[PDB]
């Protein structure tokens, strides 16, 4: 494995992550209806949790990516040439299957990267973050030169451009996958491991449960509904999440720097740090039910979501970096790998429970009346 092959493989993993998350990022950017995002998250978490316990073959990765590409093409075709009900039905079914396929593809890529020397998971993480920031930048460049037609509540040319970009990057990722990868071919009880690291599992659930309660739902979809936020400002508000979510994962990992020494602190302090995140719920509701100019401000709404995004990414990586420090009776290599599997399950369960908890806020008369 010389420098050329290492560079090619790292680029391939970056492209895998970017292409996998481009669909979710462009669904967020286009202000797609909330139920479609909910369906996508449900499919993603279900497929990921199922694929954790089942070793699906790694030859299916190009096929899953091609399925995602043809699903994006179907998005474009349905938006262009279909009626309202047909477009809605296709959107819901396609978003469910996209969530499932993306989860399976990410699981395959994780398995392929992990089972190697000089593990390549960090490159896929970088690819995911680059996908987020790249979709943000593309949205801002599109908003200048694209008319706001809003055929079915979604911009026409903006949707076309975003999905052709997704298809192009995904086909390039398929080419790299085919060229580079080779796709041919005593322990403590689970209850004992759960009892040791029950705080780490709990903290992973809490951070994801709260941030998916707010961001895609109450986050930018009830402020816009209430204050009539311009479509140009929505991409900035959504972008403050995707940019800061990625950039907050890194400082916890770089603890060898004097600046980031205190970014990984503890599990007991993490539990009370996730409780201070509960103060975001009053903040997000106030942005949607108060009228004076302070809350009707693009600057503080961007800050109100940058802080949520920064703490979301920061508190997702912390439990992984400290859980080994507090556990007592787990000492083998396999056990810690099993425990790390418990933590990623708490992430996906957190995403599923968080996204479906947004419907709790529908009961309260949060949004302002139209008059």
């Amino acid at each position: 494995l010389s420098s050329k092959q290492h560079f090619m493989l790292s680029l391939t993993f970056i492209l895998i992550g970017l292409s996998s998350l481009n669909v979710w990022n462009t669904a967020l950017g286009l202000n797609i209806n909330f139920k479609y995002n909910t369906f996508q998250i449900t499919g993603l978490v279900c497929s990921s949790i199922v694929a954790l316990f089942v070793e699906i073959p790694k030859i299916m990765l190009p096929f899953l990516l091609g399925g995602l590409s043809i699903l994006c093409a179907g998005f474009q075709i349905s938006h262009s040439f279909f009626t309202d009900t047909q477009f809605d039905t296709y959107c819901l079914v396609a978003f469910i299957v996209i969530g499932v396929v993306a989860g399976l593809a990410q699981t395959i890529a994780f398995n392929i990267g992990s089972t190697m020397e000089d593990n390549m998971g960090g490159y896929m993480s970088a690819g995911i973050g680059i996908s987020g920031v790249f979709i943000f930048v593309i949205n801002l460049l599109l908003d200048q030169f694209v008319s706001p037609e809003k055929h079915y509540g979604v911009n026409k040319a903006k949707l076309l451009a975003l999905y052709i970009i997704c298809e192009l990057c995904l086909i390039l990722a398929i080419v790299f996958c085919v060229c580079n990868l080779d796709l041919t071919n005593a322990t403590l009880s689970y209850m004992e491991l759960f009892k040791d690291s029950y705080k780490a599992i709990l903290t992973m659930f809490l951070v994801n449960w709260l941030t998916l309660q707010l961001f895609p739902g109450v986050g930018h979809k009830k402020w816009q509904e209430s204050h009539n936020i311009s479509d140009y400002n929505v991409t900035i508000i959504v972008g403050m999440f995707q940019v800061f979510d990625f950039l907050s994962r890194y400082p916890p990992n770089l603890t060898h720097i004097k600046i980031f020494k205190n970014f990984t602190f503890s599990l007991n302090k993490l539990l009370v740090a996730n409780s201070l995140r509960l103060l975001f719920i009053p903040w997000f509701i106030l942005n949607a039910c108060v009228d004076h100019p302070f809350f009707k401000n693009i600057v503080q709404q961007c800050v109100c979501m940058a802080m949520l995004a920064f703490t979301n990414g920061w508190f997702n990586t912390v439990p992984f970096l400290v859980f080994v420090k507090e556990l007592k009776k787990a000492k083998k290599k396999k056990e810690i790998e099993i425990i790390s599997t418990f933590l990623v399950i708490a992430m996906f369960v957190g995403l599923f429970c968080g996204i479906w908890t947004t419907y709790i806020y529908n009961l309260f008369n949060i949004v302002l009346p139209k008059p």
Partner: nanobody
Framework: QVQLVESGGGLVQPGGSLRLSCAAS????????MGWYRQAPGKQRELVAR???????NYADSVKGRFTISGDNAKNTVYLQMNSLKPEDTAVYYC????????????????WGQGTQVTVSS
């Protein structure tokens, strides 16, 4: 890059003692464990001692009650005071560091040091 620096190799009369010091520089991400794996001439690597970030110590029953592992976390340096030496402990000792990053997905990475020769004879 990640650099594992070791010190302590040498030749010792039987019944003597040594101190093996190991330090980690890059360790991108956290650091879960630091241990010593000895490889005898013409044999496979075998665990000798391991020290967790918290402080849990693993030992090999061959050196049980003889070698004592101490750790640090601010400097990520691990020391091994090895006592009551006998000729069958001659080997090359490899410092191993097991880490974890999870930027977006969990990764476990092991970094191995160059290894110090330890000989007991004469």
């Amino acid at each position: 890059q990640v650099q594992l620096v070791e010190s302590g190799g040498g030749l010792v009369q039987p019944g003597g003692s040594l101190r093996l010091s190991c330090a980690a520089s890059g360790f991108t991400g956290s650091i879960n464990y630091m241990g010593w794996y000895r490889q005898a001439p013409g044999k496979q690597r075998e665990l000798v001692a391991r020290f967790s970030s918290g402080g849990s110590t693993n030992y090999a029953d061959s050196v049980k009650g003889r070698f004592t592992i101490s750790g640090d976390n601010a400097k990520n340096t691990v020391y091994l005071q090895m006592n009551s030496l006998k000729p069958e402990d001659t080997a090359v000792y490899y410092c191993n560091a097991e880490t974890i990053s999870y930027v977006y997905t969990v990764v476990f990475q092991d970094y191995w040091g160059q290894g110090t020769q330890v000989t007991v004879s004469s």
